[PDB]
Amino acid sequence: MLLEAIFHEAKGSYAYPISETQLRVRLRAKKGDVVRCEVLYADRYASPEEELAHALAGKAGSDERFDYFEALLECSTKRVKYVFLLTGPQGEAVYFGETGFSAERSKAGVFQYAYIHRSEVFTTPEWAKEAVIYQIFPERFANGDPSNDPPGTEQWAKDARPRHDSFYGGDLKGVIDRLPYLEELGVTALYFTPIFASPSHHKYDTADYLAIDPQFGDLPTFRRLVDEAHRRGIKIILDAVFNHAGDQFFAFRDVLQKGEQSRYKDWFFIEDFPVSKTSRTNYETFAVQVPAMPKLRTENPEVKEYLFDVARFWMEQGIDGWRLNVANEVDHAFWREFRRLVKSLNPDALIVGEIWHDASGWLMGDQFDSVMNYLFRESVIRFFATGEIHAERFDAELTRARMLYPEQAAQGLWNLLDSHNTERFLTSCGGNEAKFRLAVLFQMTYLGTPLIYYGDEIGMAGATDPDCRRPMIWEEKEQNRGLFEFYKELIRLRHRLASLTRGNVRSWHADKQANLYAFVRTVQDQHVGVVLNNRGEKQTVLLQVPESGGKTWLDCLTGEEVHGKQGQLKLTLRPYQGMILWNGR
Ligand SMILES: OC[C@H]1O[C@@H]2O[C@H]3[C@H](O)[C@@H](O)[C@@H](O[C@H]4[C@H](O)[C@@H](O)[C@@H](O[C@H]5[C@H](O)[C@@H](O)[C@@H](O[C@H]6[C@H](O)[C@@H](O)[C@@H](O[C@H]7[C@H](O)[C@@H](O)[C@@H](O[C@H]1[C@H](O)[C@H]2O)O[C@@H]7CO)O[C@@H]6CO)O[C@@H]5CO)O[C@@H]4CO)O[C@@H]3CO
Ligand SMILES: [Ca+2]
């Protein structure tokens, strides 16, 4: 075995607790370079003579270059020292520890997880463990009160083609009037983009964090929204824009006024005075040369307590969580304290970050509860929409990501297809409903949290910013109701099948020629196998499935009963068909 390819660290996503007495260890090694992985361990302060405990490390999944092993160490002492035993293809042996490799156990040293403080066991909202979030871009969702419409509001039709400054008049009263719809769909939470006062139509250049934007409503209307949704079993989440502020934010206006005497010059990153005009700014902004969005200095104690107060004010209205916009550009101290503050007010308040790269550092259990799974989106786009990769590359991608973070965080990533920052998925599919559906079928059955972008469930389509921000389609005979009834049924199942919301994932078949992929979700004795024939040509496959985990399954989407004929399963899928096989348990 190529030792230079065996990885593990007594922390991060390879060593962490799932309980005050249970530690999850994971090891990494070159694909097919290691056949068995066992973990010999015991209490740290144990005598050199006592007998070590054993723990078999099942192969959890396989990257495109690695194999991932995973074991669960029972640690009543809440302290532990462990060493890996790695067996080769033919039979070779080797011990893996902190000191290094050695055919001799003792000479390999031993990894140590110093102590398991219950306060550090990565914990997350239970409701968040089985949710189906629906993303709402308020300005375009529904105009329930045309009296607050901005000036210039354009028509509300299927053929609108928005500009970077267009307005259509969607407001919070519309969202309220639409809860019957949202509740019929089955969503269990709504994620709004910025709803706070701002001159723009997207509202990321916040003018006042303490007031809903006039065009959308007023606090009374909001509270009504929160109450109306709650009794409907729908939680609500807001976009926290703490990285930068709109150049209307009182504090910034002051610096623009009082110049050098402003009591807030250190609330921003001013290079020189006086502040500036057009995109030739002289104060640090989000991205590059964006005047309307000066950068907040969350490192400054004053700014921190301000935004924290801002956070206290909205959690007082009963929201259920936050979506941290541009999260990675604001310090960790901030986020840790933010988590403590939030978690104290409401233990079930969800904190989801928005980072477009390895989030490992914000997913240890002391900051975010999760993030947007852009990866899943990249994998799904290229497997179902643009056909740029195949069933096997897909399997690889799903697995590689799936191993990035501690399970707790993994279990909750927001699996989105598209956002208000991208072309709609249907468009990505060149308008191929068949393909689109298969992707949704995967989304509603894969590991994580499904995130539905308003419109998709109905068949909307469009380019990227701002064509993806068209107004919702409400005229029923202008909506894809067959697709809607599809989402409904998946979501129904997802809520009904435990394994889909609380089980794990395991590859079950990857045929790059047939371009058919299949996985299995498991929890307790329940097994739900999803088969995706992602190809435009009926096909038949035989999948391995030992008589132990059941030998008879039932397709949840058709009610067809399938039987295992000696460990094998013969399935025939119509073009692009998918099957939700349930073992009944
Ligand atoms: O006026 C600015 C912008 O404001 C609002 O954007 C939001 C956005 O909706 C949020 O989701 C979020 O997204 C951030 C990410 O959090 C951040 O990490 C980073 O991520 C990368 C982007 O994903 C990537 O595309 C690129 O950004 C480029 C972009 O590709 C360019 O096309 C260009 O974007 C311009 C837009 O085309 C234009 O519509 C407008 O955007 C509004 C937006 O409508 C509104 O929702 O202006 C921008 C120019 O600023 O430039 C950007 C950056 O140069 O690279 C980044 C990281 O390298 O960026 C995205 C946003 O791009 O937060 C933003 C702002 O709060
Ligand atoms: Ca309106």
Side-chain angles (χ1 to χ4, degrees):
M1 42 191 53
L2 294 161
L3 298 185
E4 286 89 347
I6 300 200
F7 179 70
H8 172 282
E9 61 196 340
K11 70 188 185 309
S13 320
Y14 286 98
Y16 64 71
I18 67 90
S19 170
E20 190 176 311
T21 55
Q22 324 195 76
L23 186 76
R24 176 86 59 190
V25 304
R26 306 208 290 215
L27 186 155
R28 173 173 54 163
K30 193 186 189 66
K31 197 172 193 178
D33 205 50
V34 175
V35 174
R36 198 195 204 224
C37 196
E38 195 172 359
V39 182
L40 289 64
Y41 63 99
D43 176 61
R44 282 177 55 209
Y45 292 80
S47 169
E49 301 165 293
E50 325 191 21
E51 242 304 275
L52 298 183
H54 292 60
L56 190 52
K59 183 193 283 188
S62 309
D63 202 353
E64 107 153 3
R65 290 207 173 80
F66 301 91
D67 258 348
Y68 292 94
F69 289 95
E70 207 182 73
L72 185 54
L73 290 52
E74 292 290 300
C75 310
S76 61
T77 51
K78 310 189 302 165
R79 307 178 302 206
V80 39
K81 55 178 188 173
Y82 56 84
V83 61
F84 291 89
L85 181 280
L86 312 175
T87 318
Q90 58 277 186
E92 45 184 307
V94 58
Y95 290 79
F96 190 13
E98 202 170 58
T99 305
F101 309 82
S102 168
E104 290 179 284
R105 176 156 62 71
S106 53
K107 300 191 64 182
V110 65
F111 290 115
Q112 304 191 62
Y113 205 72
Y115 194 100
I116 324 276
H117 295 99
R118 59 160 161 282
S119 72
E120 300 181 336
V121 184
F122 200 157
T123 307
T124 63
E126 287 297 311
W127 71 265
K129 291 183 175 178
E130 63 193 12
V132 172
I133 326 289
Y134 188 103
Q135 180 187 174
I136 286 166
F137 188 75
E139 223 292 324
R140 266 65 144 169
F141 186 48
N143 197 344
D145 166 10
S147 82
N148 48 45
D149 297 3
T153 288
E154 288 171 51
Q155 268 298 181
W156 199 287
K158 179 175 192 160
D159 56 63
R161 302 292 182 270
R163 279 175 291 99
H164 82 301
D165 56 47
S166 294
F167 282 94
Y168 288 83
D171 49 56
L172 290 167
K173 175 69 202 319
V175 179
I176 302 186
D177 290 327
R178 287 293 177 280
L179 304 176
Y181 177 68
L182 301 174
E183 179 183 11
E184 188 200 327
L185 184 53
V187 311
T188 62
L190 296 177
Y191 153 57
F192 297 72
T193 31
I195 55 185
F196 299 171
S198 175
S200 70
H201 85 287
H202 53 72
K203 321 287 193 179
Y204 276 108
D205 52 317
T206 309
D208 180 341
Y209 297 91
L210 294 170
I212 276 87
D213 185 293
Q215 94 160 71
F216 294 137
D218 46 65
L219 183 62
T221 312
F222 189 63
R223 292 253 45 270
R224 203 136 53 204
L225 173 57
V226 183
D227 280 47
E228 280 305 298
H230 280 173
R231 53 185 282 246
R232 234 166 278 270
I234 299 172
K235 293 180 169 49
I236 86 121
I237 293 151
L238 324 182
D239 202 313
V241 199
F242 304 154
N243 178 68
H244 44 83
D247 58 341
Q248 298 268 67
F249 182 60
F250 84 91
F252 194 72
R253 278 172 38 61
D254 184 333
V255 178
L256 281 157
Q257 180 71 54
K258 297 199 191 74
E260 187 55 287
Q261 270 59 272
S262 183
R263 225 217 64 58
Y264 308 85
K265 41 177 157 49
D266 290 10
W267 271 44
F268 301 95
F269 289 82
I270 312 300
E271 301 171 7
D272 33 68
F273 291 97
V275 188
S276 278
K277 40 56 203 314
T278 230
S279 284
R280 272 179 51 177
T281 60
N282 61 317
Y283 51 96
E284 203 185 309
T285 73
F286 148 98
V288 180
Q289 296 292 274
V290 188
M293 313 182 151
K295 180 194 181 55
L296 293 169
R297 168 169 283 175
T298 66
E299 279 184 289
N300 182 318
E302 296 179 320
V303 178
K304 178 169 50 182
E305 205 42 53
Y306 179 87
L307 291 174
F308 280 13
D309 278 335
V310 173
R312 295 207 190 66
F313 175 74
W314 292 104
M315 282 196 67
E316 208 169 306
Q317 312 310 329
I319 58 181
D320 308 286
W322 308 83
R323 203 310 296 282
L324 314 180
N325 172 80
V326 148
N328 59 324
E329 292 197 41
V330 14
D331 54 300
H332 288 97
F334 186 117
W335 295 124
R336 282 196 198 77
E337 285 161 45
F338 177 71
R339 190 199 181 77
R340 183 176 53 178
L341 184 257
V342 176
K343 295 299 173 184
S344 69
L345 271 45
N346 178 186
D348 309 0
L350 192 68
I351 308 195
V352 175
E354 190 207 25
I355 303 185
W356 304 136
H357 59 73
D358 203 297
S360 192
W362 297 271
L363 291 178
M364 306 285 64
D366 63 5
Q367 291 163 66
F368 304 174
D369 289 302
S370 182
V371 299
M372 312 284 241
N373 200 348
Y374 70 104
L375 252 33
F376 160 107
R377 196 231 159 197
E378 267 170 48
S379 305
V380 175
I381 270 288
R382 270 146 65 261
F383 178 58
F384 297 101
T386 62
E388 286 178 294
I389 74 178
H390 61 242
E392 296 186 1
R393 178 60 182 127
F394 181 66
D395 183 42
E397 290 181 19
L398 261 10
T399 311
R400 195 166 113 88
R402 172 163 147 277
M403 292 291 151
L404 272 52
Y405 322 113
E407 68 214 75
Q408 297 101 311
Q411 163 272 154
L413 292 300
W414 279 10
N415 300 318
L416 64 343
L417 308 186
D418 40 10
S419 78
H420 59 287
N421 294 134
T422 78
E423 50 163 4
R424 279 169 185 280
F425 202 65
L426 199 280
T427 282
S428 294
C429 289
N432 187 300
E433 204 178 323
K435 293 181 190 171
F436 176 99
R437 298 212 175 190
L438 193 64
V440 171
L441 196 164
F442 173 55
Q443 185 188 211
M444 298 306 146
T445 54
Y446 186 60
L447 184 90
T449 282
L451 181 57
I452 313 185
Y453 185 68
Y454 88 95
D456 287 10
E457 5 79 85
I458 281 312
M460 281 192 65
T464 202
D465 211 329
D467 201 19
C468 62
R469 297 174 183 178
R470 302 174 181 185
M472 183 66 177
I473 302 278
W474 289 116
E475 329 300 352
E476 184 170 308
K477 251 45 196 54
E478 185 160 287
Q479 306 179 312
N480 199 313
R481 303 298 292 197
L483 179 52
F484 179 82
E485 278 296 322
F486 181 52
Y487 267 77
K488 281 181 64 189
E489 191 178 4
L490 297 177
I491 293 177
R492 291 219 305 293
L493 286 177
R494 193 177 186 76
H495 290 307
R496 178 194 300 101
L497 290 167
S499 54
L500 298 171
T501 66
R502 287 144 182 294
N504 59 175
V505 239
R506 284 294 187 282
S507 293
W508 182 35
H509 197 67
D511 189 301
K512 55 179 189 168
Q513 229 63 53
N515 203 59
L516 168 163
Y517 176 73
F519 57 100
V520 179
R521 297 296 299 283
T522 317
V523 88
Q524 287 318 321
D525 299 339
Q526 171 175 154
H527 289 62
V528 167
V530 183
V531 197
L532 325 164
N533 174 48
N534 179 25
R535 165 64 77 61
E537 265 269 54
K538 184 175 187 176
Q539 291 188 172
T540 302
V541 289
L542 283 135
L543 309 173
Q544 289 310 101
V545 262
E547 323 164 18
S548 54
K551 46 184 169 59
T552 300
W553 291 264
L554 182 55
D555 186 5
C556 296
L557 295 176
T558 72
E560 183 208 352
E561 176 179 270
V562 295
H563 307 295
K565 58 175 194 62
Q566 296 192 299
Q568 272 193 296
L569 245 163
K570 206 171 185 274
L571 282 19
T572 312
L573 315 296
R574 291 172 276 96
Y576 298 111
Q577 149 161 31
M579 290 176 72
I580 306 290
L581 275 43
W582 176 47
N583 86 310
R585 286 190 235 104

